[PDB]
Design a protein around this ligand. Structure first.
Ligand code: FES
Ligand SMILES: [Mg+2]
Ligand SMILES: [Mg+2]
Ligand SMILES: [Mg+2]
Ligand SMILES: [Mg+2]
Ligand SMILES: [Mg+2]
Ligand SMILES: [Mg+2]
Ligand SMILES: [Mg+2]
Lengths: 96, 54, 99, 137, 85, 122
RNA sequence: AAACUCAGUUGACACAAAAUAGACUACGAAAGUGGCUUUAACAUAUCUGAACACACAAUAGCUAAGACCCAAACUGGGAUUAGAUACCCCACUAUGCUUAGCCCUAAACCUCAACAGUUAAUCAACAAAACUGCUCGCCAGAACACUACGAGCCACAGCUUAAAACUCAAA
């Protein structure tokens, strides 16, 4: 017909998906450091997914691991462990 | 990002029971709400205390 | 002996350019308000950019400038909208003059 | 170093010293800002009582207690009582969201005492002890 | 059963207790503790709690979309270029 | 199946800790567990003041016992751990490595919900 | 106002309830299910099908035995009012919880049946766009009537099924 006609194909310019920071990584109830990275420093409240940026699956896993650690004695409940205050900040929160 | 409205409302073809029950349609209006509408109390208390003690 | 419309579309510069995201284009200041330059860059819609605080006087009608395109047309669908609302203008970053 | 809002880590080599005393050593000021009443009790690092005050003790009656003015009066009274005990720097630990929540601190300051930290401790039950039924007015 | 003076604790900088208290109130408000206490004062029956949560979610959706539209159209607040037509 | 016993033991001397670990692993084996590994997470301050057997504890030694046991032995092991005084706390969980990292290609975008209302004009 | 001499710090301390996550929309047939661990476990088909049986069925309620922090009909007191058998305040009981049986009702509503399919030429109004095929269930003016009688039921001031007479031109 005509060589210049468009050819059916997937978008070659499609950008890779923004995999959540924890995607492809094993969340564990013993990694109290990583679990504390996703709680409020002052109230120990688990941050919502809008703050954490995590996918749904990883947010659910983080929440369950936090609960497991808190109830099994690996993590504090009412506050972030002080030793992990200076850990990298991955939550889009701003109190001050 | 805005919370997903997919499958939230009660509609035909939606197997799940409603997640949201908006008393008003979730359609943007063409207007925004009007801007909704005791100082010196410490100074008053200080002056009144000075009066009390003098 | 006539080039097909498909041929012209395939071999036109706008088609040559891939996604407009962050591409560099050469625009022309076709209309200026006090501090708002309306720059045409060959796309369907022009962009609007504030006159830079530096060398702002150097920008004038027909002054050829360099832009970094963020979107050929600024549009978006809104809660309840049946069709996308468009502001009928491209979103581009003004980098400076070109010589 | 630029100011850090977090309290000093317990049992750690902290440099901060208020009159040469460590943060765990600074006395405490427990403020209970009930809805209608406010109470202030100053205790030592070993929770030894130092002073007490409240809207009722300062003399405000019935609705007058649950007011910022009464809270400031109670704060001033508690600060004055603690000053005779020698309290200078205090860590405020306020529980409750009564009208006197902040006026208590303001009066505790006007009485002379200096505050080094504010620690909200309002009892928030994760869940338990069902509260009373809602009021219909 | 927790270590005291670590949770919900703010160190007042240079004695500005006003600023320290405002920052603490901001922290508690962002964490939602203030609203939690205010609602927990009186029991919120489960049906009423569900209705309030639904209303809050709908309000959040509408307000976020309206803010998105406002920001998207802000650029069009410029002065009219075609004045006289 | 495969379990991990997360154990918080009273912070005590090396001989006592070794004796308690031997006792716990022996109980596991007697109940039928095939102990796979034993890793010590060190002694640390507990996140909160645990009170076990009327005795309050602020510090404890954290240990993990990875093992395979019949499903029926888990309840008996839990009961024995509870009855053991030297154990501040102990929880048998399904070993995390028995779970898989099923692919999650990313955060797929959720398009704005469409056709949620009739197109009636007002 | 009545009411308690009890109130604050710290420590020990449940058979009650289960912040944040949750801006997630998942599980279950429905009712329902959002603290943690483990065990068992989430029917079938590449259809529909029960006052015609079997099994479930929130909350409330009944019988018996326990628990009882808190809440709480009822009850008492305080206040209010012309009166207040209520709204507001305080105390407390059944009850809310556990065990074993009953009871089988909800605006049990997403008031939108199951399965399959379509978006094509639309659609009383509103609501959650309009329909096609197929099957079951149900309805034939309002009120009498979640009623009477009969029948069945661990139900005994009950539940399911459920009329008619008289009346009206409306509902
Ligand atoms: S984005 Fe892939 S696991 Fe979350
Ligand atoms: Mg069938
Ligand atoms: Mg049936
Ligand atoms: Mg029932
Ligand atoms: Mg009782
Ligand atoms: Mg009935
Ligand atoms: Mg009947
Ligand atoms: Mg009968």
């Amino acid at each position: 017909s005509n060589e210049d006609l468009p050819i059916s194909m997937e978008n070659p310019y499609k950008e890779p998906l923004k995999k959540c920071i924890l995607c492809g990584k094993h969340v564990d109830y013993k990694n109290v450091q990583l679990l504390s990275q996703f709680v409020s420093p002052f109230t120990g409240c688990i941050y919502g997914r809008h703050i954490t940026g995590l996918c749904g699956k990883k947010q659910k896993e983080i929440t369950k691991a936090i609960k497991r650690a808190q109830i099994m004695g690996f993590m504090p409940v009412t506050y972030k462990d002080p030793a992990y205050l200076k850990d990298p900040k991955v939550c889009n929160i701003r109190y001050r | 990002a805005t919370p997903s409205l997919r499958g939230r409302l009660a509609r035909f073809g939606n197997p799940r029971k409603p997640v949201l029950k908006p008393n008003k349609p979730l359609i943007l209006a063409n207007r925004v709400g009007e801007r909704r509408r005791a100082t010196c109390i410490t100074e008053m208390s200080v002056m009144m205390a000075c009066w009390k003690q003098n | 002996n006539v080039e097909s419309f498909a041929s012209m579309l395939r071999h036109s510069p706008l088609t040559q350019m891939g996604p407009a995201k962050d591409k560099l284009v050469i625009g022309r200041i076709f209309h200026i308000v006090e501090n708002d330059l309306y720059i045409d860059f060959g796309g369907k819609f022009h962009c609007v950019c504030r006159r830079p605080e530096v060398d702002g006087e150097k920008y004038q009608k027909g002054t050829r400038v360099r832009l970094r395109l963020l979107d050929l047309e600024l549009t978006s669908r809104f809660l309840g909208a049946t069709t996308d609302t468009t502001v009928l203008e491209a979103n581009a970053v003004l980098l400076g003059i070109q010589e | 170093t630029k100011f850090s809002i977090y309290p000093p880590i317990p049992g750690e080599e902290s440099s901060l010293r208020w009159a040469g005393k460590k943060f765990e050593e600074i006395p405490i000021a427990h403020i209970k800002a009930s809805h209608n009443n406010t109470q202030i009790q100053v205790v030592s690092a070993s929770n030894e009582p130092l002073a007490f005050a409240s809207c009722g003790t300062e003399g405000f009656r019935n609705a007058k207690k649950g007011t910022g003015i009464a809270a400031q009066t109670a704060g001033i009274a508690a600060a004055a009582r603690a000053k005779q005990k020698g309290v200078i720097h205090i860590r405020v630990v306020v529980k409750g969201l009564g009208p006197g929540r902040l006026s208590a601190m303001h009066g505790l300051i006007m009485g002379g005492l200096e505050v080094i930290s504010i620690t909200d401790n309002t009892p928030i039950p994760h869940n338990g002890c069902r509260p009373r039924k809602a009021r219909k007015l | 059963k927790h270590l005291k003076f670590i949770a919900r604790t703010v160190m007042v900088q240079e004695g500005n207790v006003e600023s320290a208290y405002r920052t603490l109130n901001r922290i508690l408000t962002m964490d939602g503790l203030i609203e939690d206490i205010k609602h927990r004062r009186y029991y919120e029956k489960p049906c009423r709690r569900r209705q309030r949560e639904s209303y809050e979610r709908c309000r959040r959706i509408y307000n976020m979309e309206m803010a998105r539209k406002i920001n998207f159209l802000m650029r069009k607040n410029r002065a009219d270029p075609w004045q006289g037509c | 199946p495969r379990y991990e016993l997360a154990l918080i033991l009273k912070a005590m001397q090396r001989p006592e800790t070794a004796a308690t670990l031997k006792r716990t692993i022996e109980a596991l084996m007697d109940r039928g567990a095939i102990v796979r590994d034993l890793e010590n997470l060190g002694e640390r301050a507990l996140p909160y003041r645990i009170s076990a057997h009327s005795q309050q504890h602020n510090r404890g030694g954290y240990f993990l016992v990875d093992f395979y046991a019949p499903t029926a032995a888990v309840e008996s092991m839990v009961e024995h751990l509870s009855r053991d005084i030297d154990v501040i706390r102990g929880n048998i969980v399904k070993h995390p490595l028995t779970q898989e990292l099923k692919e999650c290609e990313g955060i797929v975008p959720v398009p704005l919900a469409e056709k949620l209302y009739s197109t009636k004009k007002r």
